[PDB]
Structure 1
Amino acid sequence: MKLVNFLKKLRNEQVTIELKNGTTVWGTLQSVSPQMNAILTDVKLTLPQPRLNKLNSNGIAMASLYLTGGQQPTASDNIASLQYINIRGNTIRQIILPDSLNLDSLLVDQKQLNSLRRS
């Protein structure tokens, strides 16, 4: 069992990848590499403010969003809408999956089932 082979099965679905910065990437997912290198397409990077007034946020990730090139210049919040982002795998903390997909079809490892039938 490697859950990366689970995650490769998704391949056309709106996910939200929450990275270790705090930045969250919402978008249609294309392929996933065997090191969890997500490639999303129609993405909407955003950085959630912490709802308490005095607390700032990540400052480095503010710089990273502006420097992507996609921040809307009139925009109030840190959002950056950009076609084609590519994400190196060690950055992903968690991936918010869609509500609709059935886990009990997808989590069946074909290779584990293959060996277990064979042996």
Structure 2
Amino acid sequence: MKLVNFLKKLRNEQVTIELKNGTTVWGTLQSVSPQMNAILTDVKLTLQQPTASDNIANTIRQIILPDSLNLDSLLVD
């Protein structure tokens, strides 16, 4: 009965997410936790300049996923 359950299906996806501090991090998703703790692999983080980190990991404003994902098929239980 939550949108957090479909977000665990968002694993392996690339997401350029914004934060409450307001940084930019483009990277592939590893896993999604029930409290929104997300793990990123092969990431491109930006604040300052853009700086690459490999294993990037409540402040997330929204993850802007790619348009290649069909949303209604994942939006079912």
Q: Give the TM-score normalised by structure 2.
A: 0.82
More strand by share: 2
Q: How many residues align?
A: 76
- In structure 2, runs of 5+ residues without a counterpart are none
Overall identity of the aligned pairs, in %:
100
Is the 8 Å Cα contact of residues 18 and 62 (structure 2) preserved in structure 1? yes
Q: CA deviation at 1:95?
A: 0.7
The CA deviation string for residues 9-51 of structure 1, in whole angstroms up to 9 with x for no partner, is: 01111111111111011100000010000100111111xxxxx
SS at match of 1:76: coil
The CA deviation string for residues 42-95 of structure 1, in whole angstroms up to 9 with x for no partner, is: 11111xxxxxxxxxxxxxxxxxxxxxxxx8799999999xxxxxxxxx110111
Runs of 4+ displaced beyond 6 Å: 71-80
CA distance 1:74–1:37, change in 2 (3 Å): closer
> If you compute each CA radius of gyration, which structure gives the higher value, 1 or 2?
1
Is the 8 Å Cα contact of residues 19 and 93 (structure 1) preserved in structure 2? yes
More helix by share: 1
Q: Give the TM-score normalised by structure 1.
A: 0.55
- What is the RMSD computed on CA atoms of the aligned residues? 4.7
Q: CA deviation at 1:3?
A: 0.7
